[PDB]
Amino acid sequence: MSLKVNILGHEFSNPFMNAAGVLCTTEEDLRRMTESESGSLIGKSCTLAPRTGNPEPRYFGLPLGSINSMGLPNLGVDFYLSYAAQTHDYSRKPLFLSMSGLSVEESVEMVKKLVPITKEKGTILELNLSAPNVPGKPQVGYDFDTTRTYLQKVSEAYGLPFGVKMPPYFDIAHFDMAAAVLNDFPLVKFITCVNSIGNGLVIDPANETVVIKPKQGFGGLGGKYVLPTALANVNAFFRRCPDKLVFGCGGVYSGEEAFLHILAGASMVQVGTALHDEGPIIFARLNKELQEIMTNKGYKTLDEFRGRVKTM
């Protein structure tokens, strides 16, 4: 029995890691992720300068998942670059950093700074193209022209293998266009599907009031709301981008959901809402439950079923 994933030169113990934005903003956070049973971890989506984010309340836990408008609260690119350079124990597990400049200029400047650390330490870049909670800033991934610009300029400035955290798409034509852009950039070695289902509204019937303060209650949705969306996106990019990996993200609460992600095509499986609720101890549970399903089915490795979902 093995949960191991061997990708991009690294041996991951299992396919699990935090989703960008959950338990990865502060040094304490990253330490707790490093000490967890997770296969990897990813730093909070950072900007050039620090950000404090949106006003409170900006996170509300729901029966079926979560709503948030965090606003990219981060300690600044320099803090995360220092975590990657000086602090992080790589013998424990590989490290990803999420970078989320609020313009292409910004992202280009941050990405250059990672090149030397990537080269010395092996730190992996995930470019955030799905920031849904910044007032006045659109999700880049729903504009295929802008996406192209970002991938072009980041490819040039970084010049090493990276991946892209995509917004969820809801239309076949969009899968086609998205894939057409991505496939023109060979340095894009992995696609993380998906980010929050953007700009949901949750209202409390009791007090007739929204549950979050920013943007009139409008926040990205995670948790059980997102699983079918996540699987669809994972599979669609799995098929259309065979030269690339796909990382699954959305609605993972257990091994069963992790199994479906991998079955859909996922190499690594990211956990957000559920990790927020349960804490990094969830990864111990996920490993055992995923081992359980594989044992019951007679799968010895993830490679036996990765992307082997059956159609009718």
Ligand X SMILES: Cc1cc2c(cc1C)N(C[C@H](O)[C@H](O)[C@H](O)COP(=O)(O)O)c1[nH]c(=O)[nH]c(=O)c1N2
Ligand Y SMILES: O=C(O)/C=C/C(=O)O
Would you tell me which residues interact with ligand Y (CB under 6 A)? Answer: 21, 45, 69-72, 128, 130-133, 195-196, 220
Q: Which helix (H) or strand (E) holds 60?
A: strand 59-62
Helix (H) or strand (E) holding 43: strand 41-46
Total site size for a copy of itself, rule CB under 8 A: 57
Look at residue 298 and give the partner it binds from ligand Y, a copy of itself, ligand X, none, a contact being a CB closer than 5 to 8 Å depending on partner kind.
none
64 near a copy of itself, judged by CB under 8 A: yes
Nearer Cβ to ligand X (98/107)? 98
Strand order in the sheet with 266-271: 16-18, 266-271, 245-249, 188-193, 162-165, 124-128, 95-99, 41-46
Could you say whether residue 154 binds ligand X (CB under 6 A)? no
The answer to whether 75 and 50 have CB atoms below 8 angstroms apart is: yes
C-alpha 272/C-alpha 249 separation (Å) is 8
User: If binding is defined by CB under 6 A, does position 54 make contact with ligand X?
Assistant: no
Of 250, 263, 269, 257, which Cα lies nearest the Cα of 303? 263
| Closest approach of ligand X to the CB of residue 298, in Å | 28
Question: Given the complex with ligand X, which of 24 and 299 has the nearer CB atom?
Answer: 24
Give me the 137-166 binding string for a copy of itself, x by CB under 8 A, dash otherwise.
-xx--x------------------------
Q: How far apart are CA 268 and CA 281, in angstroms?
A: 18
Binding residue (CB under 6 A) for ligand X from 75, 245, 271, 290? 271
- Report the run of H or E that residue 287 belongs to, with start and end: helix 282-297
Q: Which of 158, 190, 259, 283 touches a copy of itself (CB under 8 A)?
A: 259
Task: Please give the backbone phi and psi of residue 228, each rounded to the nearest 5 degrees, phi first.
Answer: -55, -40
CB of 138 to ligand Y, least distance (A): 12
| Distance, CA of 308 to CA of 304 (rounded, Å) | 8
5-14 as b/e: b if 16+ CB within 10 A: bebeeeebbb
Residues written for the chain: 312
Report what 71 binds from a copy of itself, ligand Y, ligand X, none; CB cut-off 5-8 Å by kind.
ligand Y
Tell me which of ligand X, a copy of itself, ligand Y, none is bound by residue 249, counting a contact when its beta carbon lies within the kind-specific cut-off of 5 to 8 angstroms.
ligand X
Q: Beta strand pairing status for 197-201 and 188-193?
A: unpaired
Helix, strand or coil, per DSSP, at residue 211 = coil
| Partner that binds at residue 111, options ligand X, a copy of itself, ligand Y, none, CB closer than 5 to 8 Å by kind | none
Q: What minimum distance in Å lies between the beta carbon of 90 and ligand Y?
A: 25
Q: Rounded to 5 degrees, what are φ and ψ at 24?
A: -155, 10
Q: Are strands 245-249 and 218-223 parallel, antiparallel or unpaired?
A: unpaired
Binding mask 201-240 for a copy of itself (x = CB under 8 A): xxx-x-xxxx-xx-xxxx--x--xx--xx-xx-xxx----
Q: Which spans of this chain sit near ligand X (rule: CB under 6 A)? A: 19-22, 44-45, 59, 65-66, 68, 70, 72, 98, 128, 130, 165, 195-196, 222-223, 226, 249-252, 271-274, 276
Q: Which spans of this chain sit near a copy of itself (rule: CB under 8 A)? A: 57, 64, 67, 132, 135, 138-139, 142, 167-175, 197-203, 205, 207-210, 212-213, 215-218, 221, 224-225, 228-229, 231-232, 234-236, 256, 259-260, 263-264, 293, 305, 308-312
